[PDB]
Design a binder for this molecule. Structure first.
Ligand SMILES: O=S(=O)(O)c1cccc2cccc(Nc3ccccc3)c12
Ligand SMILES: O=S(=O)(O)c1cccc2cccc(Nc3ccccc3)c12
Ligand SMILES: O=S(=O)(O)c1cccc2cccc(Nc3ccccc3)c12
Ligand SMILES: O=S(=O)(O)c1cccc2cccc(Nc3ccccc3)c12
Ligand SMILES: O=S(=O)(O)c1cccc2cccc(Nc3ccccc3)c12
Lengths: 157, 157
């Protein structure tokens, strides 16, 4: 089955800048900062729809990876969708985790980051809170890492 | 004027550990990771209630600081309250900003971080969205930075 969860996050970062950092510069920033992500490599494509990326990261003291697919890109409306489709980093009860994101004008020149997660469980397995919350936690952690990088480097943004 | 805002975040980190990191190890962690925070000075007190900490940060293209005061500590119930009473880092429209935090166990094994922020505006003046959102953005940034550290160093926790 499909489980949907929507969330919004405000930021002082201007829309155009945030969108660029999250969708075009994130792979580069993630390997640059001291976070969980250790390496990102293109398995297929170079960024456009259909692209498959292998992301290797450290979960505690162990390494795992996920395969990521680029579902859609609407640069005109600052939209970007993609999903995690495999790898050892993907919970056993999950078949696919899809993200639908959009950046809109926020308050005081800042923006609003809207995200819709869609959990596709394996064999209609139930979605435990633990699995759902861990994904939200990782999604929130990654977002803050990029936003934080943007805020700390005004010459670049 | 006094404006209130609440929030809850679920974490996979056990209660006691998340609490120790946020309230006892954070001063050191902030200096170990590369974030906005540059230094933490104990101006008066040793960390117990009544303590005044001076926190300095590199806001990217400029520097600023805030005076933090420890309002209450309840180690038994994993409670910790404090507030920003001054510094160039505190917006002019604000007189004081208070935080009331608590960590409770999740029903399934994690922990939930509850936070209540109380904005004290200067004499009936309204609270601007920009000020409100920026404050929330920094609070979440700090929290996630500390949560990230624990998850990346299971050996230490
Ligand atoms: O694709 S990520 O941008 O890291 C990613 C981003 C946002 C939310 C995520 C949730 C679960 C797993 C991920 N991947 C993962 C990657 C390596 C090891 C373990 C898990 C998530
Ligand atoms: O009286 S408070 O309600 O905290 C307070 C409330 C509102 C604004 C304040 C500004 C400076 C100092 C305070 N007090 C203070 C008290 C003890 C130690 C350090 C500072 C302020
Ligand atoms: O993160 S703090 O350790 O207080 C902090 C430390 C050092 C310098 C700071 C400068 C501006 C804002 C802060 N924080 C802030 C957080 C929430 C609401 C309003 C201001 C600063
Ligand atoms: O807004 S900043 O200019 O970085 C910033 C400046 C000054 C003090 C800060 C204190 C805590 C968090 C921030 N932001 C943050 C936001 C997202 C992720 C990590 C940290 C602070
Ligand atoms: O849960 S972690 O084991 O760190 C983790 C492990 C593996 C891949 C991750 C990918 C994105 C975010 C995480 N969390 C995160 C949480 C807080 C701050 C920054 C990143 C990831």
């Amino acid at each position: 089955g499909v489980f949907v969860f929507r969330d919004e996050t405000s930021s002082s970062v201007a829309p155009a800048k945030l969108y660029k950092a999250l969708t075009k510069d994130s792979d580069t920033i993630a390997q640059k900062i001291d976070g969980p992500i250790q390496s990102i490599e293109l398995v297929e494509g170079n960024g456009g729809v259909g692209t498959i990326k292998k992301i290797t990261a450290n979960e505690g003291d162990k390494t795992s990876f996920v395969l990521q697919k680029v579902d859609a890109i609407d640069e005109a409306n600052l939209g970007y969708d993609y999903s995690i489709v495999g790898g050892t980093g993907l919970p056993e009860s999950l078949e696919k985790l899809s993200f639908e994101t959009k950046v809109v004008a926020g308050s005081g020149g800042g923006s609003i980051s809207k995200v819709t997660l869609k959990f596709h469980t394996k064999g209609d397995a139930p979605l435990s809170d633990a699995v759902r919350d861990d994904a939200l936690a990782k999604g929130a952690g990654f977002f803050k890492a990029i936003e934080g990088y943007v805020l700390a480097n005004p010459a670049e943004y």
